[PDB]
Amino acid sequence: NPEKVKVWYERSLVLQKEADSLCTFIDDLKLAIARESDGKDAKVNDIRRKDNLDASSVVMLNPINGKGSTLRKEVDKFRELVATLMTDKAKLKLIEQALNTESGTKGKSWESSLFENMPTVAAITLLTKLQSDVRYAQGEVLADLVK
Amino acid sequence: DVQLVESGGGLVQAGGSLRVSCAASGRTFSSYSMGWFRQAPGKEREFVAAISRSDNSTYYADSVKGRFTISRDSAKNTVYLQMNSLKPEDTAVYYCAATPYGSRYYLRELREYDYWGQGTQVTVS
C-alpha cells in the first residue's frame, strides 16, 4: 500500500520549515514595530499604548536597515514554493496566490504602499493576517501532499 | 529582567580547541535567543554566533564559520560555544547576550540584544 511516503514526508518537511521561518520573521517584525513604537518592554499583544505612524515606516522602510523588501522576497519565495508543491487546483493556488500578493499601488513598492504612513496597530494586524494566510496555505498544501 | 553567567575562558596555542559556556535563568531560553559576541583588542564588539529559540537554527560570522559551534541544553539552561582550529585573531573578550527575536534578520544585530553578560577573556598564542 505505501511506496513514495518519502516524497510526502520530504516535501511536507520543506514546507513546514519555510512556513515556520516566515511566521517567525513576521513575529519579529510585529515585535520590532511594537518596540519602536513604545519601548524595549513593549508587548506585541492587544490594548497597547502609544499608536504611532512612524514605527512601521522606520522598521519596514528605513534606507539602511528596512525589512520591507526582505519581507516581500520571503513571501514571494513561500508563494513560489506553494505553487511547486500544489497539485492542479488552479482555483486553489489562485486563492493562496491572491492571499500572498506582492502588488503595490502605481509607481511604489508593495512595502511602501502597505507601511507608508500606517498606524502601529494597523501594521501589526496586517502582519497577523499575513501569518494566518501563510498557515492557511500550509494546511491546504499539506492536505494536497497526502493526495 | 534576565541574568546570564559566563565560565570557560582560557589561554591556548594556535590550532588548539576550547569551550565557553553561558548560564541562563528561568524560562528565558524559551522566550529569548542566545547570542555570543567577541571584542578584538582596541576594536568595537562584533557578533560571533547565535542560537534561535523558534527554529533552533544556528548563525555564525563568516570568520568563525566551520571552526565554531553554538549549542543549547534546555534542562541545564546552558549554551556552549565550541571553538576549534583557534587562530591568534580569535583573541578577544567573549560576551553573552539574549534577544527576544528568533529570525536570521535580527540575530546578527548587536543592537537587538536586550541582556548581556560580563564575559571571559580568551587568548590564543
Author numbering:
A (entry chain A): 70 to 216
B (entry chain E): 1 to 52, 52A, 53 to 82, 82A, 82B, 82C, 83 to 100, 100A, ...
From the paper:
Finally, we cloned, crystallized, and determined the structure of the N-terminal domain of PorMp (residues 30–212) in complex with a nanobody (PorMpNt) (nanobody not represented). Surprisingly, PorMpNt, the D1 domain of PorM, is missing the first helix (residues 30–69), which was probably cleaved during crystallization. Another difference between the D1 domains of GldMp and PorMp is the organization of dimer packing. In GldMp, both D1 domains are packed side by side using their α1 helices; in PorMpNt, the four monomers in the asymmetric unit do not pack together, probably because the α1 helix that forms the D1 domain interface in GldMp is absent in this structure. Finally, a complete domain can be modeled by assembling the various fragments using the GldMp scaffold: PorMp315 was structurally aligned with PorMp224, the PorMp224 D2 domain was aligned with the GldMp D2 domain, and the PorMpNt D1 domain was aligned with the GldMp D1 domain, together with the modeling of the first PorMpNt helix using α1 from GldMp D1.
